[PDB]
Amino acid sequence: KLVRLPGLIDVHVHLREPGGTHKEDFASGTAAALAGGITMVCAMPNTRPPIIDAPALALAQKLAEAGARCDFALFLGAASENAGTLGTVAGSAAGLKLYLNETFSELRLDSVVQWMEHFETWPSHLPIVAHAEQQTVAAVLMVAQLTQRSVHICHVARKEEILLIKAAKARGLPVTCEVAPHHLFLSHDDLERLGPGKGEVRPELGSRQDVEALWENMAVIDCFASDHAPHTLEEKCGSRPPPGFPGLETMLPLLLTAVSEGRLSLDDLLQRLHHNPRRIFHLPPQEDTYVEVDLEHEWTIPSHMPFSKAHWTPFEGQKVKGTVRRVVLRGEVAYIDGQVLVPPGYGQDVRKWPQGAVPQLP
Amino acid sequence: KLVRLPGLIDVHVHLREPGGTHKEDFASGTAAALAGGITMVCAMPNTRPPIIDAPALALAQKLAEAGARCDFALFLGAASENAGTLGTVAGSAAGLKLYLNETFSELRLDSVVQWMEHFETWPSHLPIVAHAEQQTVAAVLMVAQLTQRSVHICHVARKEEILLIKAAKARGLPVTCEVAPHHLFLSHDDLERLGPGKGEVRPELGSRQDVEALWENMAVIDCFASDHAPHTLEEKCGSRPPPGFPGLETMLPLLLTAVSEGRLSLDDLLQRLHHNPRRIFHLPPQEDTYVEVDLEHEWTIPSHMPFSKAHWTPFEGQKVKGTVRRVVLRGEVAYIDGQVLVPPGYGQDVRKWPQGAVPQLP
Numbered sequence: 001k002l003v004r005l006p007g008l009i010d011v012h013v014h015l016r017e018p019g020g021t022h023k024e025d026f027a028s029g030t031a032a033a034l035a036g037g038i039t040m041v042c043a044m045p046n047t048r049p050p051i052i053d054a055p056a057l058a059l060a061q062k063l064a065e066a067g068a069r070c071d072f073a074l075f076l077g078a079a080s081e082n083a084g085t086l087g088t089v090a091g092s093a094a095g096l097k098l099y100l101n102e103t104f105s106e107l108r109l110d111s112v113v114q115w116m117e118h119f120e121t122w123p124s125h126l127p128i129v130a131h132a133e134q135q136t137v138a139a140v141l142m143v144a145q146l147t148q149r150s151v152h153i154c155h156v157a158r159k160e161e162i163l164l165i166k167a168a169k170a171r172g173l174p175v176t177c178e179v180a181p182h183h184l185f186l187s188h189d190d191l192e193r194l195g196p197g198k199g200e201v202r203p204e205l206g207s208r209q210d211v212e213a214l215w216e217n218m219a220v221i222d223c224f225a226s227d228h229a230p231h232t233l234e235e236k237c238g239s240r241p242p243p244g245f246p247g248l249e250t251m252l253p254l255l256l257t258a259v260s261e262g263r264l265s266l267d268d269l270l271q272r273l274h275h276n277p278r279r280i281f282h283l284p285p286q287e288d289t290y291v292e293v294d295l296e297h298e299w300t301i302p303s304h305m306p307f308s309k310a311h312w313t314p315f316e317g318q319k320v321k322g323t324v325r326r327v328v329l330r331g332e333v334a335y336i337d338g339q340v341l342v343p344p345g346y347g348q349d350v351r352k353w354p355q356g357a358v359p360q361l362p
Numbered sequence: 363k364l365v366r367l368p369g370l371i372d373v374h375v376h377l378r379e380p381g382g383t384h385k386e387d388f389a390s391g392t393a394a395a396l397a398g399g400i401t402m403v404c405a406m407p408n409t410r411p412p413i414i415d416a417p418a419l420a421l422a423q424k425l426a427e428a429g430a431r432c433d434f435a436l437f438l439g440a441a442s443e444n445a446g447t448l449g450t451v452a453g454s455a456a457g458l459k460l461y462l463n464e465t466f467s468e469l470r471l472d473s474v475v476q477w478m479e480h481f482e483t484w485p486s487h488l489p490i491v492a493h494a495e496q497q498t499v500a501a502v503l504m505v506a507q508l509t510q511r512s513v514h515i516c517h518v519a520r521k522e523e524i525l526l527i528k529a530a531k532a533r534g535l536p537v538t539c540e541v542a543p544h545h546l547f548l549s550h551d552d553l554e555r556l557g558p559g560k561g562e563v564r565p566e567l568g569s570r571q572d573v574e575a576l577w578e579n580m581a582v583i584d585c586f587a588s589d590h591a592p593h594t595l596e597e598k599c600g601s602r603p604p605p606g607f608p609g610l611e612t613m614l615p616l617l618l619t620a621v622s623e624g625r626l627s628l629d630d631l632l633q634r635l636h637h638n639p640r641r642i643f644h645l646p647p648q649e650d651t652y653v654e655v656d657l658e659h660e661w662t663i664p665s666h667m668p669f670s671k672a673h674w675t676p677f678e679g680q681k682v683k684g685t686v687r688r689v690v691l692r693g694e695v696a697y698i699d700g701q702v703l704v705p706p707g708y709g710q711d712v713r714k715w716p717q718g719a720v721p722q723l724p
């Protein structure tokens with residue numbers, strides 16, 4: 001007996017095209033999404049070239065329309081030079097992404113004044129998301145208040161961060177957040193097995209107390225999002241390991257395992273992988289789109305999942321219960337039992353759909 | 363320049379059919395919905411016969427399928443005799459409605475033990491909503507905790523209630539709520555004009571401080587819902603006035619006026635009349651469905667709106683800015699500039715759509 005889920009949405013993925021296609025491309029990363037029960041992805045802008053201007057966005061749109069197998073929206077990235085220049089193209093993006101800490105990105109921002117300039121110039125009705133760790137969460141919240149608008153915090157990883165966000169929500173402030181599976185299912189206790197190269201990720205793996213705090217504060221977590229961040233094993237284990245884990249293919253199995261154990265409900269999961277992504281990013285419905293899962297199937301995560309070009313996973317050896325059996329996307333069988341059945345280019349840019357524009361006052 | 367909104371959802375309406383069709387019927391009440399920019403309604407069970415058993419639900423379903431012009435879901439009502447009897451039909455309903463205070467209903471419940479029995483027997487994945495005023499909010503929240511599940515509070519009207527819910531949300535409890543337009547836009551100050559018969563409503567009109575508290579605590583309000591509760595003028599002004607206001611045709615114009623004044627954003631409105639109704643009640647998308655509004659049109663609410671058989675309104679004389687110009691429902695023009703263009707029976711029971719079933723574990 002299979003359970004029918006709606007089309008799940010991952011608001012934080014790295015698909016590496018353009019410029020990093022040995023790590024992943026639209027075709028492989030969206031194959032990984034479908035096999036993970038994800039029918040729509042929002043792709044981050046820290047590509048090569050980075051998606052920080054209209055020409056780069058135009059290139060990325062065509063690459064995605066030609067390669068993606070599931071539907072998508074593309075983020076724009078904030079830079080030290082582009083505030084006030086994105087107004088014509090802003091509504092065509094998923095949102096604007098700010099990189100406020102050190103990670104796998106060249107998109108620095110040297111001053112909180114540059115953050116303020118982005119919050120002041122980006123259209124006020126369109127999403128802003130931030131990589132903002134520890135005190136940076138409080139700092140970007142201050143900027144959001146000074147400019148009288150909302151902010152969404154990416155990959156919340158620490159007790160410190162979730163409690164800060166909790167306090168802000170208690171004061172009625174417009175902040176939402178997401179949490180990635182590795183910050184719920186891995187911790188410092190896994191660093192010995194992973195080793196120092198594989199274990200590199202930003203935000204770093206937290207303590208057991210960090211993990212426990214995120215679970216205890218599930219009500220504060222608006223979304224789950226993988227932060228699928230593929231790099232090859234050679235890169236992860238070489239002389240300058242880049243931070244990040246692949247995660248599209250493992251996210252839903254890990255979370256289904258937790259549902260089966262009573263750690264959260266099926267509804268809690270569907271709020272965080274479907275309804276709340278829709279409402280925070282004003283992402284449209286996908287007609288005739290659903291995911292069939294088998295909640296009884298027990299299996300062990302292998303050394304690499306089938307699709308991501310990362311060809312490794314930090315969750316190797318974990319026992320899970322729940323698997324994706326079938327995905328239907330806009331009336332076509334997209335995935336069955338390990339076979340992707342829609343070609344590169346089947347996926348579409350949801351921001352071009354009439355129902356995918358973010359509503360605004362004239 | 364018109365603004366395109368998604369199809370709005372009203373999770374709390376009284377359509378009076380069966381048994382009260384001089385006040386409203388499915389055809390007139392859903393005409394009123396469309397003219398108010400509402401494309402899906404959830405109809406309360408305090409009809410004659412009340413929708414408290416499978417035969418009554420079967421009757422109501424056929425009446426709604428034949429009369430409704432927009433899409434709908436039907437609530438079941440809790441009674442003193444039906445706990446544990448609704449399991450076969452529960453998933454076909456919008457949810458289960460508990461009447462916990464005195465109002466226009468015969469659906470009493472004499473004991474909190476009966477509340478507990480409903481919370482214990484109703485399927486745990488399906489919505490429960492309550493008419494629960496003042497301390498009754500705290501009491502039903504206690505029952506929800508004892509039985510380890512969620513509850514949604516209907517028509518929150520008082521500072522006392524919104525602050526209680528706020529405290530519960532700060533403790534991570536699974537409670538949501540809605541607010542009706544008359545508790546945002548009318549107060550004790552309007553009782554002299556309305557008079558004692560027209561002014562009868564449950565919850566009663568609040569003080570200026572109650573109204574101010576709901577506005578100040580907008581972040582706590584998950585949904586707007588009209589509690590469209592039509593009665594004729596003769597009934598409202600006769601010897602035993604029933605409580606309730608019609609409200610489908612005035613809700614969106616009143617709220618658009620508030621958006622235009624900067625009291626809440628367009629997004630705040632769309633969360634509360636579209637995204638949050640969807641996610642709390644697991645209501646499906648409506649394909650090719652949207653509402654076009656004119657935000658500049660100023661007008662004064664007349665003594666009765668065109669469609670509701672109530673043929674009166676408590677908002678008469680209020681100046682509003684914003685009007686519904688066009689509604690498209692599932693690819694057909696449903697409403698233009700005062701003309702309803704879909705017949706009775708165009709609307710469908712969204713719980714019968716494959717995408718309209720509430721997901722559950724096997």
Ligand SMILES: NC(=O)N[C@@H](CC(=O)O)C(=O)O
Binds near residue numbers: 104
């Ligand atoms: N999280 C990571 O460790 N790496 C991400 C970037 C990010 O989300 O910061 C990547 O793109 O590799």
Ligand SMILES: NC(=O)N[C@@H](CC(=O)O)C(=O)O
Binds near residue numbers: 562565589592605606
């Ligand atoms: N609110 C009212 O005053 N009346 C409503 C019932 C209700 O929502 O309690 C009605 O059905 O007339």
Ligand SMILES: [Zn+2]
Binds near residue numbers: 103155
């Ligand atoms: Zn990041």
Ligand SMILES: [Zn+2]
Binds near residue numbers: 011153
């Ligand atoms: Zn993110």
Ligand SMILES: [Zn+2]
Binds near residue numbers: 012227
């Ligand atoms: Zn990232």
Ligand SMILES: [Zn+2]
Binds near residue numbers: 278279282283632637
């Ligand atoms: Zn939206």
Ligand SMILES: [Zn+2]
Binds near residue numbers: 465493516517564565
């Ligand atoms: Zn009521």
Ligand SMILES: [Zn+2]
Binds near residue numbers: 373491515516517540
């Ligand atoms: Zn209600």
Ligand SMILES: [Zn+2]
Binds near residue numbers: 374375376406589591
């Ligand atoms: Zn009611």
Ligand SMILES: [Zn+2]
Binds near residue numbers: 275641
């Ligand atoms: Zn749902």
